[PDB]
């Protein structure tokens, strides 16, 4: 029993964190094989290729623990700077660079000065921002998932937006959202609730003995979406319905049956009650996260 | 900016998790130097659990009865002893991944990270607090026994908890790394219930200071209170009594924000009386008590 916001064990990622200094700027790098990846704004209207041509290898000070790494080359790929180093990381794990979709969750290893300080779980919002916990010096901190023994790197922190939310890129330097790496007026779009995740979390509550919100009713997918659109909820697709299949079979509650409960929770509230210790409807657990936490899959 | 429930990086602890098998039972062990620590109930059957005589069950065991597995490698047990509710298995190999560590006993209200394991393999990490009733609201399934709770302050891992059992209400009970249970619990299948739980008042106050640091002041009021008047109101909402130690410990946050501890106590009294009125504090619709004053100073 129990339901916590759970992160993947961070060990394979900790062995990759390095500190990158260029001039006055100091941020974090991800050392995989003989390449260190970090936000390109470490060299900072910035014409980045023009700023980079002026730089030489010995301008970038890379520090892995108490050891200095020697930069032997550098290139830029989108908004990430790739520093070729003289030493391959012996702690390099089995890895992939993956681009995630909004609604998908991942673990964040927050670092300052190449040293990991905390791990937390979070979701890529529909507006492409992440509601993270980051201070100055956290840039270059990475987001990941683990599949067996393969670490899938999906996010690298770049900046904080005026509302306190965070923006960054995949490990190929492509931003998530309509954001740019520079000092200019940028705002996060209006956010929406990840409907499929709230439903998965309602199924997790049923599995943990919380059934007060269930009813005898059902709904059509169109009628549910007409209601969901009124409450700033993401539209529920037939793919979402298919993906919720295993949880529906395990609990004996049809997806459109659980949708009718969510409909009543939106129109009438919780009435002083809680679900899984929460007074709000939680959307940062995917259907897979619910299944993994209620089966015990190890890494 | 931002405020998340954050766990310590689990890497130093992952390198210590092993699988311990004794007969039909399989649980997790903590391999530090040449010793593997695990719950002593690994020697028990489900029948034995009612009234087990551990000394009697252990005298009948030999080193080769305990199968210890570290990854794909089998460890050879060369000795065994019992210390309170923990079984200490002397192994022939010292763990090369052994970090700098301490065994610490925590007090209720203190937080720690839990690395949940099944079959000696870590599956997840989460942050949680030792409740005033000595239970932990964890996320544990069958096979999680032997999973540990820790804090990693600076370069040292301070082991403070080892999982032993789940209580009928879904909450968890365990020991410090010396085998001493937290709470009036026993490693026995007897009628045991968690006491009535209370809110960790000092932690809610620290979390209110964290919200002020992050720009949220809607909950503040022009009132102050005496410590006694605050505790008389707090008791009625099942809140732990706030002591003068708690007031002293909240000093740095009080100085940083410019809000006196008894002034913040006045906001909490009002919040307990009025609720949130559709508003949230740090993205929460409830008053959060699993962030200590030290956690707030570390994260903000
Ligand atoms: C001096 N004091 C006010 C600094 C604290 O500021 C902060 C505070 C919190 C931060 C959290 N994450 C990431 C930061 N970094 C940035 O957003 C830097 C930046 C600026 C313009 C464009 C880009 Cl791409 C990146 C954070 C900086
Ligand atoms: C359905 N049931 C028979 C399966 C087991 O379910 C569970 C489910 C969740 C569990 C979480 N933590 C720890 C468990 N283990 C124990 O409580 C084992 C035990 C029993 C009596 C006394 C002691 Cl000291 C220890 C959990 C077992
Ligand atoms: Cl303590």
XYZ file of C-alpha atoms and ligand atoms in Angstrom:
654
model
C 0.000 0.000 0.000
C 0.873 3.687 -0.360
C 1.115 6.126 -3.266
C 4.037 8.485 -3.587
C 5.436 10.684 -6.340
C 8.351 8.397 -7.102
C 11.466 9.098 -9.109
C 13.783 6.600 -10.846
C 16.975 5.716 -8.942
C 19.435 8.512 -9.979
C 22.742 6.576 -9.674
C 23.415 5.966 -13.390
C 22.880 9.724 -14.021
C 24.934 10.954 -10.978
C 28.080 9.352 -12.496
C 27.607 11.639 -15.586
C 27.316 15.085 -13.952
C 30.232 17.482 -14.483
C 30.760 21.251 -13.922
C 31.282 23.507 -16.953
C 32.834 26.985 -16.649
C 33.261 29.489 -19.474
C 34.385 32.897 -18.308
C 32.117 34.048 -15.495
C 29.308 31.483 -16.184
C 29.257 28.122 -14.357
C 26.637 25.441 -15.092
C 26.232 21.610 -15.348
C 27.268 19.223 -18.088
C 26.314 15.655 -18.959
C 29.462 13.565 -19.629
C 28.621 10.575 -21.857
C 31.606 8.734 -23.475
C 34.158 11.455 -24.555
C 31.524 14.229 -24.961
C 30.155 16.707 -22.400
C 26.722 18.149 -23.279
C 25.566 21.473 -21.796
C 23.320 24.520 -22.664
C 25.014 26.666 -25.338
C 24.249 29.850 -23.292
C 27.350 29.031 -21.130
C 29.342 31.078 -23.763
C 27.004 34.132 -23.198
C 20.541 39.074 -29.377
C 23.217 36.332 -29.243
C 24.547 35.026 -32.594
C 25.848 31.842 -30.963
C 27.868 30.554 -33.971
C 29.641 33.959 -34.060
C 30.329 33.874 -30.267
C 31.564 30.227 -30.481
C 34.051 30.857 -33.361
C 35.955 33.235 -30.985
C 36.250 30.496 -28.291
C 39.061 28.005 -28.039
C 39.087 24.599 -26.286
C 41.053 25.868 -23.273
C 38.363 28.555 -22.562
C 35.971 25.813 -21.291
C 36.996 24.462 -17.851
C 35.374 21.056 -17.285
C 35.481 19.543 -13.803
C 34.496 15.933 -13.024
C 34.586 15.650 -9.221
C 38.086 16.612 -8.085
C 39.532 16.009 -11.619
C 39.884 18.481 -14.492
C 38.890 17.227 -17.972
C 40.804 18.467 -21.041
C 38.580 19.880 -23.830
C 39.941 18.822 -27.269
C 37.070 20.066 -29.483
C 33.668 21.772 -29.565
C 30.563 21.925 -31.729
C 26.999 23.200 -31.414
C 23.850 21.194 -32.121
C 20.753 23.392 -31.913
C 20.778 24.883 -28.315
C 23.279 22.356 -26.849
C 27.067 22.753 -26.862
C 29.019 19.471 -27.315
C 32.468 19.553 -25.739
C 34.808 16.838 -26.943
C 36.951 15.790 -23.976
C 40.200 13.782 -23.763
C 38.785 11.216 -21.304
C 35.842 8.872 -21.859
C 33.575 8.501 -18.804
C 34.087 5.040 -17.295
C 30.738 5.419 -15.500
C 28.885 5.994 -18.857
C 25.683 3.923 -18.737
C 23.620 2.344 -21.536
C 21.727 5.404 -22.869
C 19.462 6.923 -25.550
C 18.415 10.494 -26.297
C 14.610 10.601 -26.497
C 12.128 13.419 -27.148
C 9.060 13.190 -24.908
C 5.470 14.331 -25.537
C 3.441 16.587 -23.147
C 1.800 14.520 -20.391
C 4.839 12.236 -20.147
C 6.707 12.203 -16.814
C 10.430 12.011 -15.970
C 12.913 12.242 -13.086
C 15.037 15.369 -12.642
C 18.442 15.254 -11.020
C 18.976 18.875 -9.894
C 22.709 19.849 -9.805
C 24.758 22.872 -8.768
C 28.479 23.063 -9.673
C 28.446 19.570 -11.217
C 27.226 18.103 -7.894
C 23.788 16.432 -7.669
C 21.705 17.738 -4.775
C 18.237 16.268 -5.281
C 15.992 14.073 -7.361
C 12.311 14.663 -8.086
C 9.604 13.442 -10.413
C 7.702 15.779 -12.733
C 5.665 15.969 -15.956
C 6.094 17.806 -19.243
C 3.061 20.151 -19.136
C 0.749 20.539 -22.200
C 2.180 24.144 -22.470
C 5.719 22.568 -22.680
C 6.932 24.005 -19.376
C 7.923 21.929 -16.353
C 6.941 22.899 -12.802
C 10.424 22.252 -11.414
C 12.422 23.283 -8.381
C 15.474 25.076 -9.678
C 17.783 27.813 -8.368
C 20.641 29.778 -10.062
C 23.344 27.321 -11.157
C 20.881 24.493 -11.927
C 21.236 24.976 -15.757
C 22.335 21.777 -17.466
C 20.459 19.548 -14.908
C 18.862 16.613 -16.740
C 15.537 14.773 -16.925
C 15.461 11.040 -17.573
C 13.538 7.752 -17.463
C 14.947 4.228 -17.043
C 13.928 1.204 -19.131
C 15.564 -1.885 -17.643
C 19.266 -0.768 -17.745
C 18.940 1.973 -20.411
C 18.756 5.573 -19.265
C 16.622 7.623 -21.640
C 17.745 11.285 -21.450
C 14.816 13.530 -22.355
C 15.432 16.993 -20.859
C 18.158 19.501 -20.120
C 17.332 22.601 -18.058
C 17.984 26.003 -19.719
C 15.858 28.739 -18.116
C 13.214 29.902 -15.691
C 10.156 31.810 -16.986
C 8.639 34.841 -15.108
C 5.898 32.674 -13.522
C 8.493 30.430 -11.803
C 8.091 27.591 -14.345
C 10.995 26.061 -16.279
C 11.943 25.605 -19.918
C 14.562 23.449 -21.600
C 15.524 21.233 -24.526
C 15.790 17.539 -25.424
C 19.463 16.234 -25.482
C 19.683 17.209 -29.188
C 19.233 20.936 -28.248
C 15.650 21.277 -29.478
C 13.490 23.312 -27.076
C 10.194 21.969 -25.779
C 7.706 24.763 -26.498
C 7.868 28.079 -28.331
C 10.864 29.237 -26.255
C 14.335 30.642 -27.177
C 17.634 30.709 -25.208
C 17.926 34.461 -24.591
C 16.881 37.453 -22.468
C 13.544 38.550 -24.034
C 9.818 38.688 -23.120
C 8.652 35.049 -23.091
C 5.618 33.704 -21.282
C 4.243 30.242 -20.657
C 0.988 29.578 -22.482
C -2.277 28.842 -20.640
C -1.920 25.411 -19.091
C -4.337 22.483 -19.185
C -4.811 19.367 -17.024
C -3.472 16.069 -18.389
C -6.831 14.167 -18.417
C -5.388 10.672 -19.054
C -3.034 11.118 -16.073
C -5.877 12.198 -13.698
C -7.846 9.079 -14.778
C -4.811 6.799 -14.118
C -4.467 8.424 -10.653
C -8.203 7.762 -9.985
C -7.541 4.078 -10.873
C -4.541 4.081 -8.486
C -6.866 5.343 -5.713
C -9.346 2.508 -6.453
C -6.457 -0.016 -6.219
C -5.570 1.515 -2.809
C -9.128 1.161 -1.452
C -10.422 4.736 -2.155
C -13.851 4.185 -3.957
C -16.020 7.052 -2.633
C -15.959 8.857 -6.016
C -17.328 5.912 -8.018
C -20.871 5.998 -9.358
C -23.222 3.764 -11.410
C -23.001 6.094 -14.433
C -21.211 6.057 -17.755
C -20.639 8.624 -20.556
C -19.881 8.885 -24.258
C -16.327 9.995 -25.186
C -17.793 13.067 -26.969
C -19.915 14.053 -23.901
C -16.914 13.675 -21.610
C -14.740 15.873 -23.891
C -17.423 18.586 -24.089
C -17.260 18.739 -20.219
C -13.454 18.433 -20.080
C -13.076 21.418 -22.527
C -15.042 23.615 -20.072
C -12.607 22.832 -17.177
C -9.318 23.369 -19.074
C -8.707 19.635 -19.361
C -6.827 18.141 -22.313
C -9.117 16.220 -24.751
C -9.232 12.464 -24.026
C -8.501 10.453 -27.170
C -9.287 6.825 -28.139
C -5.505 6.180 -27.619
C -5.856 7.351 -24.005
C -8.843 5.004 -23.609
C -6.808 2.077 -25.039
C -3.803 2.908 -22.800
C -6.077 2.895 -19.697
C -7.252 -0.664 -20.657
C -5.065 -2.667 -18.223
C -6.137 -0.514 -15.189
C -9.788 -0.803 -16.323
C -9.482 -4.616 -16.420
C -7.612 -4.797 -13.057
C -10.193 -2.747 -11.150
C -13.312 -3.759 -13.130
C -14.192 -0.108 -13.911
C -14.640 0.828 -17.624
C -12.660 3.914 -18.796
C -15.887 5.768 -19.737
C -17.252 4.730 -16.287
C -14.210 6.357 -14.582
C -14.786 9.390 -16.929
C -18.298 9.823 -15.448
C -16.710 9.968 -11.928
C -14.232 12.643 -13.150
C -17.189 14.553 -14.696
C -18.935 14.630 -11.260
C -15.652 15.589 -9.504
C -15.307 18.572 -11.875
C -18.931 19.749 -11.561
C -19.274 19.169 -7.785
C -15.763 19.113 -6.214
C -14.400 16.884 -3.430
C -16.834 18.068 -0.668
C -14.204 18.077 2.082
C -12.907 14.647 1.033
C -9.435 13.669 -0.287
C -8.212 11.089 -2.839
C -4.794 9.540 -2.071
C -4.163 12.270 0.527
C -4.845 15.051 -1.999
C -7.577 17.730 -2.101
C -6.787 18.433 -5.819
C -6.991 16.148 -8.874
C -3.381 14.991 -9.555
C -2.124 14.838 -13.195
C 1.609 13.957 -12.893
C 1.306 10.119 -12.838
C 0.989 8.505 -16.289
C -0.930 5.192 -16.725
C 2.492 3.422 -16.903
C 3.686 5.072 -13.664
C 0.533 3.787 -11.911
C 1.100 0.218 -13.275
C 4.837 0.224 -12.355
C 4.215 1.529 -8.791
C 1.454 -1.121 -8.274
C 3.540 -4.134 -9.507
C 7.123 -3.301 -8.343
C 9.329 -3.093 -11.481
C 13.113 -2.835 -10.635
C 16.332 -1.342 -12.202
C 11.872 29.431 -7.960
C 9.640 26.392 -7.424
C 8.999 24.031 -4.515
C 9.054 20.273 -4.911
C 9.136 17.297 -2.559
C 12.741 16.422 -3.277
C 14.635 13.251 -2.436
C 18.426 12.902 -2.076
C 20.288 11.394 -5.050
C 20.065 7.604 -4.383
C 23.343 6.484 -6.066
C 25.437 5.938 -2.921
C 22.608 3.766 -1.504
C 21.919 1.806 -4.774
C 25.480 0.386 -4.640
C 24.636 -1.160 -1.201
C 21.412 -3.059 -2.003
C 21.630 -6.861 -1.993
C 19.046 -9.696 -1.997
C 18.792 -11.953 1.079
C 17.145 -15.392 0.919
C 16.547 -17.743 3.839
C 14.405 -20.713 2.917
C 11.244 -19.492 1.199
C 11.597 -15.803 2.331
C 13.381 -13.262 0.095
C 13.953 -9.620 1.145
C 16.552 -6.783 0.822
C 19.840 -6.285 2.631
C 22.136 -3.304 3.090
C 25.760 -4.285 2.320
C 28.181 -1.932 4.121
C 31.851 -3.069 4.345
C 31.812 -6.886 5.051
C 28.368 -6.862 6.766
C 24.881 -7.224 5.258
C 22.079 -5.791 7.443
C 18.497 -7.018 7.021
C 15.242 -7.506 9.080
C 15.627 -10.533 11.383
C 12.145 -11.817 10.287
C 13.842 -13.278 7.134
C 14.471 -16.446 9.314
C 10.670 -16.689 10.067
C 7.938 -18.569 8.279
C 4.426 -16.927 8.184
C 3.400 -19.441 10.970
C 6.361 -18.354 13.171
C 5.307 -14.681 12.877
C 2.562 -14.961 15.548
C 4.967 -15.539 18.499
C 8.460 -16.054 17.061
C 11.382 -16.877 19.330
C 14.164 -15.394 17.183
C 17.010 -16.622 19.370
C 15.655 -20.175 19.021
C 15.190 -19.827 15.227
C 18.704 -18.325 14.743
C 20.632 -20.923 16.811
C 19.258 -23.546 14.305
C 20.667 -21.667 11.315
C 24.082 -22.005 9.769
C 25.944 -19.545 7.496
C 25.144 -21.523 4.305
C 21.371 -21.246 4.985
C 21.464 -17.498 4.053
C 21.877 -16.915 0.287
C 23.133 -13.364 -0.352
C 23.073 -12.009 -3.903
C 24.825 -8.779 -4.970
C 23.814 -8.194 -8.599
C 24.844 -11.270 -10.584
C 27.328 -12.368 -7.840
C 26.716 -14.619 -4.839
C 28.234 -13.468 -1.525
C 29.560 -16.055 0.964
C 28.179 -15.702 4.511
C 30.949 -16.386 7.097
C 29.076 -15.389 10.285
C 25.821 -14.068 11.735
C 24.577 -12.184 14.765
C 21.376 -10.470 15.836
C 21.230 -6.913 17.156
C 17.708 -6.086 18.346
C 15.421 -6.622 15.226
C 18.232 -6.591 12.636
C 20.205 -9.617 11.487
C 23.893 -8.867 10.695
C 25.381 -11.236 8.149
C 29.162 -11.259 8.048
C 30.190 -11.782 4.413
C 33.538 -12.771 2.829
C 33.664 -9.730 0.510
C 33.741 -6.068 1.528
C 31.599 -3.801 -0.666
C 33.893 -1.663 -2.849
C 30.971 0.733 -3.407
C 30.614 1.310 0.415
C 30.125 5.056 0.923
C 31.003 7.299 3.890
C 28.168 6.449 6.316
C 26.620 6.809 9.816
C 23.703 5.087 11.531
C 21.403 7.783 12.960
C 18.139 7.524 14.957
C 15.660 10.209 13.891
C 12.864 11.910 15.854
C 9.208 12.273 14.612
C 8.822 15.181 12.210
C 12.225 14.403 10.583
C 12.249 13.676 6.850
C 14.283 11.186 4.794
C 14.527 9.603 1.302
C 13.429 5.995 0.793
C 14.960 3.752 -1.852
C 12.280 1.095 -2.414
C 13.784 -2.306 -3.509
C 12.464 -5.712 -4.565
C 14.873 -8.683 -4.877
C 17.911 -6.530 -4.080
C 17.059 -4.243 -7.064
C 16.125 -0.571 -6.504
C 12.920 0.471 -8.240
C 12.157 3.966 -6.955
C 13.084 6.836 -4.681
C 10.742 9.073 -2.675
C 10.831 11.596 0.149
C 8.835 11.096 3.352
C 8.607 12.024 7.067
C 8.644 10.019 10.310
C 5.073 10.672 11.563
C 4.394 11.713 15.197
C 2.769 8.232 15.647
C 6.147 6.680 14.486
C 4.729 5.242 11.268
C 5.770 6.299 7.756
C 3.259 6.849 4.952
C 5.318 4.907 2.416
C 4.709 3.179 -0.881
C 5.683 -0.423 -0.324
C 4.613 -3.779 -1.772
C 5.441 -7.386 -0.718
C 9.225 -7.929 -1.040
C 10.098 -4.314 -0.086
C 11.297 -5.382 3.430
C 14.869 -4.268 4.047
C 14.460 -1.082 1.897
C 16.222 1.824 3.608
C 15.619 5.466 4.521
C 18.507 7.917 4.459
C 19.715 11.534 4.338
C 22.817 12.570 2.380
C 24.077 15.683 4.031
C 27.373 16.745 2.429
C 29.348 13.549 1.408
C 27.987 11.261 4.182
C 24.986 8.916 3.947
C 23.095 8.771 7.269
C 21.028 5.591 7.388
C 17.978 6.156 9.603
C 15.341 3.573 8.640
C 14.920 -0.014 7.491
C 11.477 -1.228 6.404
C 9.986 -4.177 8.351
C 6.185 -4.254 8.066
C 2.927 -2.801 6.853
C 0.198 -2.043 9.431
C -3.547 -2.742 8.728
C -4.182 0.929 7.794
C -1.639 0.794 4.923
C 1.071 2.654 6.872
C 4.578 1.311 7.438
C 6.740 0.478 10.446
C 10.450 -0.209 10.762
C 13.639 0.176 12.772
C 16.778 2.336 12.865
C 19.933 0.532 11.498
C 20.631 -0.797 15.040
C 17.373 -2.852 14.960
C 15.404 -0.622 17.339
C 11.822 -0.065 16.189
C 10.366 3.418 15.870
C 7.127 3.318 17.855
C 5.479 0.735 20.091
C 5.716 -1.920 17.345
C 7.096 -5.502 17.300
C 8.259 -7.744 14.390
C 5.368 -10.044 15.133
C 1.946 -10.680 13.531
C 0.047 -9.539 16.644
C -2.846 -7.031 16.802
C -0.938 -3.782 16.276
C -2.447 -0.496 15.258
C -0.947 2.873 14.491
C -1.820 5.515 17.082
C -3.973 8.533 16.083
C -1.823 10.690 13.834
C -1.196 14.417 14.195
C 0.109 17.182 11.916
C 3.767 18.184 12.346
C 3.130 21.866 13.260
C 6.779 23.018 12.961
C 6.942 21.560 9.422
C 3.702 23.305 8.293
C 5.142 26.622 9.618
C 8.439 26.075 7.731
C 6.393 25.360 4.550
C 4.411 28.620 5.106
C 7.799 30.456 5.321
C 8.880 28.696 2.069
C 5.710 30.063 0.396
C 6.529 33.608 1.623
C 10.085 33.206 0.168
C 8.477 32.200 -3.164
C 6.295 35.371 -3.232
C 3.048 34.118 -1.722
C 1.704 36.203 1.135
C -2.111 35.899 0.796
C -2.399 33.878 4.072
C -0.590 36.442 6.282
C -2.664 38.518 8.768
C -2.100 41.461 11.181
C -2.431 39.290 14.294
C 0.091 37.643 16.595
C -0.487 35.004 19.337
C 0.934 33.678 22.581
C 2.584 30.214 22.332
C 0.008 28.842 24.786
C -2.962 30.285 22.833
C -1.591 28.845 19.586
C -1.213 25.372 21.159
C -4.762 25.459 22.610
C -6.122 26.141 19.059
C -3.607 23.611 17.397
C -4.656 20.761 19.706
C -8.269 21.049 18.459
C -7.164 20.505 14.850
C -4.966 17.449 15.710
C -1.762 19.449 15.385
C 1.360 18.565 17.375
C 2.201 20.996 20.193
C 4.687 23.671 19.105
C 7.562 23.852 21.578
C 10.050 26.651 22.366
C 12.640 24.465 20.492
C 10.446 24.642 17.382
C 10.250 28.433 17.800
C 14.072 28.644 18.101
C 14.549 26.375 15.054
C 12.237 28.617 12.969
C 14.455 31.658 13.861
C 16.510 31.826 10.616
C 13.349 31.710 8.381
C 11.714 34.360 10.627
C 14.758 36.642 10.161
C 14.971 36.007 6.380
C 11.312 36.858 5.705
C 10.809 39.442 8.485
C 7.804 37.534 9.945
C 7.978 36.578 13.672
C 7.318 32.874 14.483
C 4.280 33.749 16.659
C 3.123 36.037 13.787
C 3.294 33.070 11.341
C 1.449 31.023 14.040
C -1.370 33.600 13.784
C -1.654 32.926 9.993
C -1.782 29.179 10.664
C -4.587 29.621 13.272
C -6.581 31.622 10.656
C -5.909 29.002 7.939
C -7.183 26.247 10.277
C -10.333 28.338 10.972
C -11.050 29.410 7.371
C -9.563 26.786 5.080
C -8.049 27.921 1.754
C -11.202 29.339 0.062
C -10.331 27.944 -3.373
C -6.728 29.178 -3.120
C -3.502 27.106 -3.046
C -0.150 27.535 -1.285
C 2.866 26.259 -3.264
C 0.525 24.318 -5.587
C -1.219 22.562 -2.688
C -4.848 22.731 -1.476
C -3.845 21.145 1.909
C -1.354 22.302 4.583
C 1.884 20.339 3.934
C 3.850 18.882 6.895
C 6.639 16.797 5.270
C 9.237 19.633 4.805
C 11.350 20.364 7.896
C 12.783 23.870 8.617
C 16.207 22.475 7.457
C 14.660 21.201 4.134
C 13.188 24.654 3.448
C 16.571 26.368 4.050
C 18.248 23.732 1.780
C 15.734 23.989 -1.118
C 14.907 27.775 -1.074
C 21.012 37.119 -9.558
N 19.829 36.272 -9.421
C 18.621 37.065 -9.638
C 19.891 35.140 -10.348
C 18.893 34.038 -10.078
O 18.146 33.807 -11.283
C 17.708 32.531 -11.547
C 16.867 31.919 -10.621
C 16.375 30.669 -10.859
C 16.707 29.974 -12.045
C 16.225 28.677 -12.345
N 16.514 28.011 -13.451
C 17.308 28.614 -14.345
C 17.855 29.889 -14.202
N 18.605 30.545 -15.200
C 18.153 31.296 -16.229
O 16.965 31.410 -16.516
C 19.234 32.029 -16.999
C 18.798 32.430 -18.391
C 18.414 33.735 -18.671
C 18.003 34.097 -19.945
C 17.964 33.155 -20.962
C 18.339 31.860 -20.675
Cl 18.229 30.646 -21.923
C 18.765 31.487 -19.415
C 17.562 30.600 -12.996
C 18.060 31.897 -12.711
C -1.783 -10.184 0.467
N -0.646 -10.386 1.370
C -0.689 -11.733 1.930
C 0.635 -10.147 0.684
C 1.636 -9.288 1.433
O 1.247 -7.908 1.284
C 2.133 -6.923 1.655
C 1.835 -5.702 1.063
C 2.599 -4.606 1.324
C 3.704 -4.685 2.203
C 4.535 -3.577 2.504
N 5.572 -3.625 3.327
C 5.840 -4.799 3.916
C 5.116 -5.976 3.723
N 5.386 -7.180 4.402
C 5.012 -7.540 5.649
O 4.222 -6.897 6.338
C 5.673 -8.805 6.161
C 5.517 -8.968 7.655
C 4.386 -9.571 8.190
C 4.176 -9.597 9.561
C 5.093 -9.013 10.419
C 6.231 -8.446 9.882
Cl 7.402 -7.713 10.945
C 6.461 -8.426 8.520
C 4.006 -5.931 2.823
C 3.193 -7.054 2.520
Cl 16.050 13.924 14.003
